[PDB]
Design a protein around this motif. Structure first.
Motif, PDB file in Angstrom:
ATOM      1  N   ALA C  83      -0.318   3.238   1.826  1.00  0.00           N
ATOM      2  CA  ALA C  83      -0.515   4.100   1.628  1.00  0.00           C
ATOM      3  C   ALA C  83      -1.683   4.421   2.084  1.00  0.00           C
ATOM      4  N   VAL C  84      -2.155   6.154   2.679  1.00  0.00           N
ATOM      5  CA  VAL C  84      -3.828   6.320   2.907  1.00  0.00           C
ATOM      6  C   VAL C  84      -4.435   6.061   1.869  1.00  0.00           C
ATOM      7  N   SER C  85      -4.309   6.076   0.725  1.00  0.00           N
ATOM      8  CA  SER C  85      -4.983   6.425  -0.269  1.00  0.00           C
ATOM      9  C   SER C  85      -3.727   6.674  -1.542  1.00  0.00           C
ATOM     10  N   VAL C  86      -5.074   5.677  -2.937  1.00  0.00           N
ATOM     11  CA  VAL C  86      -4.432   5.655  -3.861  1.00  0.00           C
ATOM     12  C   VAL C  86      -4.851   5.543  -5.543  1.00  0.00           C
ATOM     13  N   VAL C 101      -0.403  -2.929  -3.883  1.00  0.00           N
ATOM     14  CA  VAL C 101      -1.023  -1.915  -2.976  1.00  0.00           C
ATOM     15  C   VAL C 101      -1.908  -2.285  -1.818  1.00  0.00           C
ATOM     16  N   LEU C 102      -1.274  -1.759  -0.876  1.00  0.00           N
ATOM     17  CA  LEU C 102      -1.550  -2.349   0.282  1.00  0.00           C
ATOM     18  C   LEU C 102      -2.205  -1.383   0.540  1.00  0.00           C
ATOM     19  N   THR C 103      -3.055  -1.123   2.445  1.00  0.00           N
ATOM     20  CA  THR C 103      -3.956  -0.447   2.793  1.00  0.00           C
ATOM     21  C   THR C 103      -3.025  -0.034   3.901  1.00  0.00           C
ATOM     22  N   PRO C 105      -3.695  -0.285   7.729  1.00  0.00           N
ATOM     23  CA  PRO C 105      -4.048  -1.172   8.276  1.00  0.00           C
ATOM     24  C   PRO C 105      -3.165  -2.917   7.745  1.00  0.00           C
ATOM     25  N   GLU C 106      -3.781  -3.262   6.256  1.00  0.00           N
ATOM     26  CA  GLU C 106      -2.688  -4.312   6.106  1.00  0.00           C
ATOM     27  C   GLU C 106      -1.763  -4.787   6.257  1.00  0.00           C
ATOM     28  N   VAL C 108       0.287  -2.800   8.523  1.00  0.00           N
ATOM     29  CA  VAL C 108       0.794  -3.752   9.811  1.00  0.00           C
ATOM     30  C   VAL C 108       0.278  -4.805  10.391  1.00  0.00           C
ATOM     31  N   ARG C 109      -1.105  -5.559   9.381  1.00  0.00           N
ATOM     32  CA  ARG C 109      -1.256  -6.555  10.533  1.00  0.00           C
ATOM     33  C   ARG C 109      -0.166  -7.624   9.759  1.00  0.00           C
TER      34      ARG C 109
END
Ligand SMILES: [Mg+2]
Ligand SMILES: [Mg+2]
Ligand SMILES: [Mg+2]
Ligand SMILES: [Mg+2]
Ligand SMILES: [Mg+2]
Ligand SMILES: [Mg+2]
Ligand SMILES: [Mg+2]
Ligand SMILES: [Mg+2]
Ligand SMILES: [Mg+2]
Ligand SMILES: [Mg+2]
Ligand SMILES: [Mg+2]
Ligand SMILES: [Mg+2]
Ligand SMILES: [Mg+2]
Ligand SMILES: [Mg+2]
Ligand SMILES: [Mg+2]
Ligand SMILES: [Mg+2]
Ligand SMILES: [Mg+2]
Ligand SMILES: [Mg+2]
Ligand SMILES: [Mg+2]
Ligand SMILES: [Mg+2]
Ligand SMILES: [Mg+2]
Ligand SMILES: [Mg+2]
Ligand SMILES: [Mg+2]
Ligand SMILES: [Mg+2]
Lengths: 152, 140, 121, 155, 278, 121
Positions: C83-86, C101-103, C105-106, C108-109
């Motif tokens: 998510a954008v933020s948590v 919980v990921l960002t 960009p995480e 996508v990588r």
RNA sequence: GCGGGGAAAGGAAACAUCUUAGUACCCGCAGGAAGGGAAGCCAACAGGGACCCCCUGAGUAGGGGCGACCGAAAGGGGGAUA
RNA sequence: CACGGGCCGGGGAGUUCACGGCCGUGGCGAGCCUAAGGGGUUCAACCCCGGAGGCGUAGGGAAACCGACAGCCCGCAGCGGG
RNA sequence: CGUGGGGUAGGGGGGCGCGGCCGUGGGGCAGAAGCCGGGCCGUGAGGUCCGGUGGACCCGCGGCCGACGAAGAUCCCGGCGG
């Protein structure tokens, strides 16, 4: 935060300031009167759009009576599902006394005075509440808990 | 003076032609009334305005059709990019093949002599040395 | 109206640029769809409560939220959510249910094509 | 640190059973009696005394006992007594003309009702609000603007 | 845990300057490297110029005083419109011996100002407490980047490292002469000299109103607590501000609403910072 | 007693409206280094009969006796700092006391010695 | 600041009840402040505890060609405390 | 042959507050914000405290009173398969 | 890429100028502002430079705020014409 240019900046050099040349910027006659007026003669079409047909009820008229608030309880209910979330937080901080082998919460010290039945109870719970709905008592009792009605 | 590539050379010559035929954009009757004689362009929003409506025989209004070629817009007539300079230290980072030096109007004679000497040594074209600086260096 | 301007937060602006570049590099329409939802006007941005993930996600699902993940309700599934933020409460509920919980960009990588990733708004 | 009395907020019918505590006007005579004091002695020690209050709260008694021991052992300094320290009565001029006699007090409504409910008080209170444009007097007709707007936006 | 703060946008977006190191360098009063201390969490906040500008404008706007004109200005002459039929415009005019002279209307000499300032106007732009403290943390983190500090306009060539942390012994310096020596050996004096030479007489009406001098800002000194001797030893330098760490604010951390202020922290101030503004 | 306000309007109003006993303070001039070691004070109000050295202006470097002091104007006349009008008369240039240095002190006044002892301390 | 006498214009798109407004203004009378102030109180079977002023309750209850519009109090948080 | 200006200079008109609707951004998020006020300060700034109260989390009914979803289908984006 | 290019009221988007403030960078008695005339740049609001006059202040760039732009109101005040 984003900032935007005031409209007066655009209106310099425009003679009319957005009010048009024909129906210019005049006094209260341009509003059809001062204040919230006209709703039964020339703004009656606004009443018919938003209000009850025939009576124009919310704009005009009486309906019912008010039970005096000084002799009426102001209810602050909580749903069973929301309560289950609350006790989970309360247990983590240690605010819950598991008095009888079951978690004991009393609603009045938690700031509520009624228990409603929306949601799910996932733990057995003893709830001390002045008022509980029919489904609240059932859902609490299906999870191994119990509702206890105290007297105000 | 500044050596430009052939695409820009044509546009610079074209810009000069556009300058000669550009109307002097005036308000209606600007020639009649001293009170608006030295005014800038105004696009008056009026009932019977004949400039806005582009009646033949009346003065022409301002439009983006009159914009000069974008690749040479703003250049000095010599082709250079003008840079305003207020002190000798401002000459750093400029390229004499691209830039011409215009000295700030309020730079005093003492500082102007230092700027002109340093700029001429570095090979910059100085647009406005001034009458006094020209006499002093010529006397030198 | 004052027409939409896009975010003033450069962190948000750089994330939107990232998602568009990631969509072009990997031929992944998902990262373009995410970027459009992220760039929505602030007054209609996406927020999702953890309790909604119960209905829309199964155990092991990988979910991208083009917005903020709020902690409301209870989560009983094991979910990988970016998510954008948590919020902290949302973070705690997801992890305690065994999830991650990921960002964005995480994610996508880890998954450049976004295969099997479910968009949740 | 001289203790402050703790009293219960009156439980209204509207509350539905929710109760809270608050700081009281003073310690009750019952609470002072349990620590062996009367109203005069407690006031001489700097304590706020409320002879009107009937309740006795054990938490108030406990706070009083703890602090009294500190005072009587020289560890705490009592503040100044909670009794009048000045007497300031000004000469009165024109009591009859300013409505301060009993006849004036009656006509002003001060015999039958509270000061806040007298008509001259209402006149002065509203005049101040309108002069400063405070609270509800910043907008005339505020109630009707809200009423009509709620109908339109909640239809 | 702070993965959402320092967002990694690789490989598609090239990295910027690295986050400040896990440790901070501490120098003694002689400018010699002494030790390292753990970096407080505040320095890992992303620098957010948009949020810093908002919080700065809020703190500055709370300072402005109400202004206005006299309530009766231009409205107290005895005037009336004399109607039509006299061959003159129907604006109000003096009633007495000055009769035809115009009066009251904004277009008349000596008339009222149509829309003057009002003392009731809201000048203070309020900000949420949580939002203000996020901006303070963002501004603090900017003091650790030479790119941000140099872009604000400070001289940072001679500063050994940033954040500039000096030993807590510096808080005992009592004389401006000794604090000057401390600034010189930490490479901070050139920025103080920039402020000393940069003071100018400003253009315009501010000269008449006690705002004749416009002075650049040089160094923010952050100490552990109030009333340490170093506060008095440095406060007379041109452009220097000094505060205890608990008094940090947007007025000293981002002058002009721009992040990155050349800051000298004492080691004890950095320690106290770990429990503040969070 | 001269305002404490930082406002230039109040600083100037203090200066122009100062009564005579305050205007005396504006007559202070620095003593020469030789007099400073002999008397132990750094400044004294200029007095008629003192000898001053002019440090600024057209008469810079001219040493002469003070012949007249004007409290209202806060100016002093010094022998040598003169010129002639068109009618041939000799007139004195009014010099501000902050622009002269006292090189000889007139100490025939007992009241002046009290001021010295106060400042020497 | 305290007591009394006391409008209209305007608003309600007319207008009279109403509002404007116990206002403007008038008459009388005080102080450096005035007035208020020590429960024939408030509450609801649980309890508060003289008064004034500030924040709130609240444009809520209620008044009103139930129209325009008008509009509390108790309670809670404070200043201060006798 | 509709009205206004002899000329020039200077002056000369959408403002502020309260409340409501909406938009563009920013903070936090099942919560959000403090008001009056209090402590400190380098003293109207700034740091900290203050959650009273307001809005939201549940509605229906004049009122007494009662009090709430993940079951199925269609299907955009997106993802998977050919 | 467009069988894109008129436009009053009106709506939407961007820029110029004026006075101040927060920053940043500079100019000035070897001559600031203002003023008269002129060249150059910009579709334009306008910017900039030169010569003369003048005699102490002023400007570029980023941000923010307004007692912020006149040709006209039988407009106001002053001056002065046929
Ligand atoms: Mg109209
Ligand atoms: Mg019509
Ligand atoms: Mg008109
Ligand atoms: Mg009708
Ligand atoms: Mg009925
Ligand atoms: Mg026509
Ligand atoms: Mg010049
Ligand atoms: Mg009202
Ligand atoms: Mg005036
Ligand atoms: Mg504002
Ligand atoms: Mg000027
Ligand atoms: Mg009126
Ligand atoms: Mg009427
Ligand atoms: Mg009538
Ligand atoms: Mg008194
Ligand atoms: Mg009295
Ligand atoms: Mg009334
Ligand atoms: Mg006509
Ligand atoms: Mg005429
Ligand atoms: Mg067109
Ligand atoms: Mg600017
Ligand atoms: Mg016009
Ligand atoms: Mg005239
Ligand atoms: Mg004549």
């Amino acid at each position: 935060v984003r900032r935007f240019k005031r409209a007066t900046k655009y209106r310099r050099g425009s003679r009319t300031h957005g009010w048009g040349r024909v129906g210019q910027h005049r006094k209260s006659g341009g509003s059809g009167g001062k204040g919230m007026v006209g709703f039964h003669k020339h703004k009656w079409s606004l009443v018919m759009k938003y209000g009850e047909s025939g009576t124009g009820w919310p704009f005009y008229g009486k309906h019912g009576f008010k039970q005096p608030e000084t002799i009426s309880v102001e209810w602050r209910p909580i749903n069973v599902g929301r309560l289950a979330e609350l006790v989970k937080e309360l247990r983590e901080r240690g605010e819950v006394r598991e008095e009888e082998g079951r978690l004991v919460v009393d609603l009045l010290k938690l700031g509520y005075n009624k228990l409603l039945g929306g949601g799910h109870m996932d733990v057995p719970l003893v709830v001390y509440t002045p008022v509980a709905s029919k489904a609240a008592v059932e859902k609490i009792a299906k999870a191994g808990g119990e509702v206890r009605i105290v007297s105000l | 003076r500044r050596e430009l590539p052939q695409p820009l050379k044509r546009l610079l010559r074209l810009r000069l032609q556009m300058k000669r035929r550009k109307p002097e954009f005036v308000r209606i009757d600007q020639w009649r009334y001293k009170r608006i004689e030295d005014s800038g362009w105004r696009n008056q929003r009026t009932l019977d305005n004949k400039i806005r409506r582009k009646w033949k025989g009346w003065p022409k209004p301002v439009e983006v059709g009159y914009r000069k070629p974008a690749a040479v817009r703003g250049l000095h007539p010599s082709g250079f990019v003008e840079v305003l300079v207020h002190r000798p230290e401002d000459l750093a980072g400029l390229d004499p093949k691209v830039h011409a030096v215009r000295i700030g109007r309020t730079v005093g004679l003492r500082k102007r002599l230092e700027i002109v000497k340093k700029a001429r040594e570095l090979g910059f074209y100085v647009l406005n040395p001034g009458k006094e600086v020209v006499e002093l260096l010529k006397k030198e | 109206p004052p027409n939409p301007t896009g975010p003033t937060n450069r962190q948000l602006r750089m994330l939107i640029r990232f998602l568009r570049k990631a969509a072009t590099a990997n031929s992944a329409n998902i990262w373009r769809a995410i970027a459009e939802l992220v760039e929505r006007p602030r007054r209609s941005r996406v927020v999702v409560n953890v309790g909604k993930l119960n209905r829309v996600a199964n155990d092991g699902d990988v979910v991208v939220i083009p917005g903020k993940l709020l902690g409301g309700g209870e989560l009983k599934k094991r979910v990988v959510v970016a998510a954008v933020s948590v919020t902290p409460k949302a973070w705690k509920k997801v992890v305690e249910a065994g999830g991650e919980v990921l960002t964005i960009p995480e994610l996508v990588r880890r998954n450049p094509k976004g295969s099997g990733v479910k968009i949740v708004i | 640190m001289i203790p402050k009395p703790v009293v219960q907020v009156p439980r209204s019918i509207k509350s539905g059973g929710v109760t809270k505590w608050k700081e009281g006007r003073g310690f009750s005579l019952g609470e002072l009696k349990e620590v062996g004091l009367n109203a005069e002695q407690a006031r001489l020690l700097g304590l706020p005394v409320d002879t009107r209050r009937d309740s006795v709260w054990p938490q108030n008694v406990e706070a009083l006992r703890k602090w009294l021991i500190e005072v009587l052992e020289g560890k705490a300094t009592p503040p100044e007594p909670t009794l009048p320290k000045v007497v300031k009565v000004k000469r009165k001029r024109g009591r009859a003309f300013r409505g301060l006699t009993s006849a004036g007090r009656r006509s002003r409504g001060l015999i039958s009702t509270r000061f806040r409910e007298t008509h001259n008080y209402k006149f002065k209170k509203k005049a101040k609000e309108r002069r400063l444009k405070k609270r509800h007097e910043a907008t005339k007709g505020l109630g009707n603007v809200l009423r009509i707007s709620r109908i339109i936006n909640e239809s | 845990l702070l993965k959402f703060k320092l967002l990694d946008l690789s490989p598609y977006i090239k990295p910027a300057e690295e986050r400040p190191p896990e440790a901070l360098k501490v120098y003694d009063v002689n400018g010699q490297y002494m030790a390292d201390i753990e970096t407080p969490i505040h320095f890992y906040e992303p620098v957010r110029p948009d949020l810093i500008r908002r919080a700065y404008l809020s703190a500055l706007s709370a300072r402005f005083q109400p202004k206005g004109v006299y309530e009766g200005a231009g409205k107290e002459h005895s005037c009336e419109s004399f109607g039509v039929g006299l061959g003159i415009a129907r604006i109000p005019r003096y009633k007495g011996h000055l009769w035809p002279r115009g009066c009251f209307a904004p277009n008349t000499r000596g008339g009222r100002r149509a829309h003057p300032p009002r003392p009731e106007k809201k000048l203070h732009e309020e900000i949420n407490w949580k939002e203000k403290n996020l901006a303070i943390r963002s501004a603090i983190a900017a003091t650790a980047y030479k790119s941000w500090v140099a872009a604000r306009g400070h001289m940072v060539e001679k500063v050994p490292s940033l954040p500039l942390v000096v030993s807590g012994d510096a808080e005992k310096i009592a004389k401006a002469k000794e604090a000057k020596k401390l600034f010189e050996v930490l490479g901070l004096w050139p920025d103080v000299e920039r402020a000393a030479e940069g003071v100018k007489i400003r253009a315009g009406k501010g000269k008449m109103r006690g705002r004749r001098y416009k002075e650049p800002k040089s160094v923010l000194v952050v100490v552990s607590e109030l009333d340490v001797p170093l506060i008095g030893a440095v406060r007379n330098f041109p452009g220097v501000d000094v505060v205890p760490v608990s008094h940090l604010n947007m007025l000293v951390l981002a002058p002009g609403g721009v992040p990155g202020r050349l800051t000298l922290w004492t080691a004890t101030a950095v320690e106290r910072l770990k429990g503040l503004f969070l | 007693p001269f305002t404490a306000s930082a406002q230039p309007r109040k600083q100037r109003l203090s200066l122009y409206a100062a009564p005579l006993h305050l205007r005396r303070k504006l007559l202070n001039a620095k003593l020469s280094p030789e007099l400073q070691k002999k008397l132990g004070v750094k400044r004294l109000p200029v007095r008629r009969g003192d000898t001053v050295l002019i440090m600024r202006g057209d008469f810079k470097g001219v040493t002469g006796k003070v012949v007249k002091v004007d409290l209202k104007r806060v100016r002093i006349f010094v022998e040598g700092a003169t010129r002639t009008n068109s009618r041939g008369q000799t007139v004195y240039y009014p010099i501000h006391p902050s622009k002269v240095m006292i090189v000889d002190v007139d100490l025939s006044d007992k009241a002046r010695q009290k001021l010295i002892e106060r400042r020497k301390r």
